[PDB]
Amino acid sequence: FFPYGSPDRFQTWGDCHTCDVESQLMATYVTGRRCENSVPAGIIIGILKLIAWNINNPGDEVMSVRNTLNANAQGLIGGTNNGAVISGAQDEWFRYRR
Amino acid sequence: TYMKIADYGQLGEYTCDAKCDAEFGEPGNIRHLEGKTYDYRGVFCFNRKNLQ
Incomplete structure (x- = not known):
């Protein structure tokens, strides 16, 4: 929460080169860490599962898991056939997703 | 626009007597x-x- 108590307001009433609107509020921070600065692991398992799925699914075998329970509309074979989800990557990358 | 008086100039000398004449000055x-x-x-x- 930005403290509503303002420390100062350096406004510039009256100007025709910039029409004195504002310089926007900016912020600097770090999202670093220790010599172990970050870990891109954990989201490597979904990548590997996607790799294996695309190795053993070249694109001629019919594979489709179903999302909705009743049907879609017509006599068609459901569908979720995307990849990275029928392989387990989406539900392993969701842990690092806001 | 306005006027200016530069200088009045000299008019008339201390001429001698018995001289039927005068000087235009300047x-x-x-x-x-x-x-x-x-x-x-x-x-x-x-x-x-x-x-x-």
Whole structure:
């Protein structure tokens, strides 16, 4: 929460080169860490599962898991056939997703 | 525009007596000057959003 108590307001009433609107509020921070600065692991398992799925699914075998329970509309074979989800990557990358 | 009196000049000397004559001297000078008026202007504007 930005403290509503303002420390100062350096406004510039009256100007025709910039029409004195504002310089926007900016912020600097770090999202670093220790010599172990970050870990891109954990989201490597979904990548590997996607790799294996695309190795053993070249694109001629019919594979489709179903999302909705009743049907879609017509006599068609459901569908979720995307990849990275029928392989387990989406539900392993969701842990690092806001 | 306005006038200016440069100098009245010399008119008449201390002439001698018994001399049926005189001297024209030297006429003065009257100049005629003039001057303009200059303008002074500027601009300032707003954003009409913080003004409300």
